[PDB]
Protein backbone atom coordinates (compact mmCIF):
# COMPACT_ATOMS: atom_id res chain seq x y z
CA UNK A 1 0.00 0.00 0.00
CA UNK A 2 1.75 3.16 1.24
CA UNK A 3 5.05 2.24 2.83
CA UNK A 4 7.43 -0.02 0.97
CA UNK A 5 9.54 -1.58 3.75
CA UNK A 6 12.20 -2.66 1.22
CA UNK A 7 13.85 0.77 1.75
CA UNK A 8 14.12 -0.09 5.51
CA UNK A 9 15.04 -3.86 4.83
CA UNK A 10 18.39 -4.02 6.69
CA UNK A 11 18.78 -1.04 9.04
CA UNK A 12 17.88 -0.44 12.67
CA UNK A 13 14.31 0.93 12.99
CA UNK A 14 12.25 2.33 15.84
CA UNK A 15 8.82 0.80 16.33
CA UNK A 16 6.18 1.96 18.85
CA UNK A 17 3.48 -0.57 19.79
CA UNK A 18 -0.08 -0.33 21.06
CA UNK A 19 0.41 -1.45 24.75
CA UNK A 20 2.99 1.28 25.35
CA UNK A 21 5.99 -0.79 24.23
CA UNK A 22 8.89 0.60 22.21
CA UNK A 23 11.15 -1.76 20.27
CA UNK A 24 14.29 -1.16 18.29
CA UNK A 25 16.05 -3.61 16.00
CA UNK A 26 17.37 -4.38 12.53
CA UNK A 27 14.63 -5.10 10.02
CA UNK A 28 15.19 -8.55 8.43
CA UNK A 29 11.79 -9.15 6.88
CA UNK A 30 8.14 -8.26 6.69
CA UNK A 31 4.74 -9.08 5.07
CA UNK A 32 1.84 -6.89 3.62
CA UNK A 33 0.11 -7.05 7.06
CA UNK A 34 3.15 -5.40 8.64
CA UNK A 35 4.29 -8.41 10.64
CA UNK A 36 8.02 -7.86 11.02
CA UNK A 37 11.10 -9.93 11.62
CA UNK A 38 13.62 -7.88 13.67
CA UNK A 39 17.17 -8.86 14.66
CA UNK A 40 19.20 -7.44 17.62
CA UNK A 41 15.92 -6.63 19.31
CA UNK A 42 15.71 -4.35 22.27
CA UNK A 43 12.40 -3.88 24.08
CA UNK A 44 11.79 -0.77 26.15
CA UNK A 45 8.88 -0.27 28.55
CA UNK A 46 7.36 3.03 29.77
CA UNK A 47 6.55 3.75 33.42
CA UNK A 48 5.57 7.17 34.99
CA UNK A 49 9.23 7.64 36.18
CA UNK A 50 10.85 6.49 32.85
CA UNK A 51 10.37 9.29 30.22
CA UNK A 52 13.73 10.83 29.24
CA UNK A 53 15.29 8.17 31.47
CA UNK A 54 14.24 5.46 28.92
CA UNK A 55 17.39 3.37 29.18
CA UNK A 56 17.01 1.59 32.59
CA UNK A 57 13.78 0.00 31.40
CA UNK A 58 15.58 -2.16 28.77
CA UNK A 59 15.30 -5.86 27.93
CA UNK A 60 17.26 -7.68 25.19
CA UNK A 61 15.29 -10.21 23.07
CA UNK A 62 17.53 -11.07 20.06
CA UNK A 63 15.56 -12.36 17.05
CA UNK A 64 11.85 -11.49 17.20
CA UNK A 65 8.61 -11.16 15.31
CA UNK A 66 6.55 -8.08 15.92
CA UNK A 67 2.86 -8.58 15.30
CA UNK A 68 1.58 -6.14 12.57
CA UNK A 69 -1.83 -5.83 14.25
CA UNK A 70 -0.47 -3.83 17.24
CA UNK A 71 2.00 -1.64 15.30
CA UNK A 72 1.29 2.02 15.93
CA UNK A 73 4.22 3.82 14.30
CA UNK A 74 7.43 2.97 12.43
CA UNK A 75 10.33 5.27 11.72
CA UNK A 76 14.20 5.08 11.00
CA UNK A 77 16.89 4.76 13.71
Amino acid sequence: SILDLSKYIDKTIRVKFQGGREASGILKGFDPLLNLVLDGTIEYMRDPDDQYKLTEDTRQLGLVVCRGTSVVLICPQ
Binding site: Q18, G19, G20, R21, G29, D31, L63
Partner: protein, 76 residues
Protein backbone atom coordinates in the same frame (compact mmCIF):
# COMPACT_ATOMS: atom_id res chain seq x y z
CA UNK B 1 8.83 -14.01 5.96
CA UNK B 2 7.35 -13.53 9.56
CA UNK B 3 4.72 -16.32 9.40
CA UNK B 4 7.36 -18.67 7.94
CA UNK B 5 9.50 -17.82 11.03
CA UNK B 6 6.53 -18.72 13.31
CA UNK B 7 6.08 -22.03 11.33
CA UNK B 8 9.85 -22.73 11.90
CA UNK B 9 9.19 -22.35 15.66
CA UNK B 10 6.68 -25.17 15.88
CA UNK B 11 8.05 -27.75 18.33
CA UNK B 12 10.66 -25.27 19.62
CA UNK B 13 10.48 -23.28 22.85
CA UNK B 14 9.00 -19.83 22.29
CA UNK B 15 8.36 -16.78 24.39
CA UNK B 16 5.13 -14.85 23.76
CA UNK B 17 5.02 -11.31 24.93
CA UNK B 18 1.75 -9.49 25.14
CA UNK B 19 0.99 -5.76 24.89
CA UNK B 20 0.94 -5.57 28.72
CA UNK B 21 3.95 -6.53 30.89
CA UNK B 22 3.09 -10.18 30.59
CA UNK B 23 4.59 -13.08 28.81
CA UNK B 24 4.18 -16.67 28.21
CA UNK B 25 7.08 -19.18 27.63
CA UNK B 26 6.31 -22.68 26.36
CA UNK B 27 6.57 -25.08 23.46
CA UNK B 28 4.75 -23.87 20.33
CA UNK B 29 2.30 -26.52 19.13
CA UNK B 30 0.74 -24.52 16.32
CA UNK B 31 -1.22 -21.47 15.38
CA UNK B 32 -4.05 -20.29 13.08
CA UNK B 33 -4.58 -17.45 10.58
CA UNK B 34 -5.08 -14.87 13.35
CA UNK B 35 -2.01 -16.08 15.35
CA UNK B 36 -4.00 -17.67 18.17
CA UNK B 37 -1.38 -19.99 19.53
CA UNK B 38 -1.53 -23.35 21.18
CA UNK B 39 1.25 -23.67 23.79
CA UNK B 40 2.23 -26.70 25.94
CA UNK B 41 3.46 -26.70 29.60
CA UNK B 42 3.49 -23.03 29.83
CA UNK B 43 5.11 -20.65 32.32
CA UNK B 44 3.19 -17.34 32.73
CA UNK B 45 5.30 -14.35 33.83
CA UNK B 46 4.35 -10.95 34.74
CA UNK B 47 7.50 -8.83 33.97
CA UNK B 48 6.50 -5.79 36.18
CA UNK B 49 6.00 -7.83 39.43
CA UNK B 50 9.23 -9.91 38.79
CA UNK B 51 7.56 -13.28 39.17
CA UNK B 52 5.82 -16.13 37.50
CA UNK B 53 2.04 -16.29 38.02
CA UNK B 54 1.49 -19.93 37.18
CA UNK B 55 3.12 -23.07 35.81
CA UNK B 56 0.56 -24.44 33.33
CA UNK B 57 0.46 -28.11 32.43
CA UNK B 58 -1.05 -29.49 29.15
CA UNK B 59 -1.99 -27.10 26.35
CA UNK B 60 -3.25 -23.52 26.36
CA UNK B 61 -4.95 -21.54 23.71
CA UNK B 62 -3.50 -18.05 24.01
CA UNK B 63 -5.51 -15.49 22.03
CA UNK B 64 -3.72 -13.50 19.27
CA UNK B 65 -5.55 -10.27 20.17
CA UNK B 66 -3.00 -9.12 22.74
CA UNK B 67 0.12 -10.79 21.28
CA UNK B 68 2.84 -8.20 20.51
CA UNK B 69 6.05 -10.23 20.14
CA UNK B 70 7.12 -13.76 19.43
CA UNK B 71 10.64 -14.85 20.39
CA UNK B 72 11.75 -18.30 19.11
CA UNK B 73 13.98 -20.33 21.48
CA UNK B 74 12.57 -18.43 24.48
CA UNK B 75 14.31 -15.93 26.85
CA UNK B 76 17.99 -15.85 27.95
Amino acid sequence: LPLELVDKCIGSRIHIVMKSDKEIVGTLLGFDDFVNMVLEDVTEFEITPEGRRITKLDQILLNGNNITMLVPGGEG
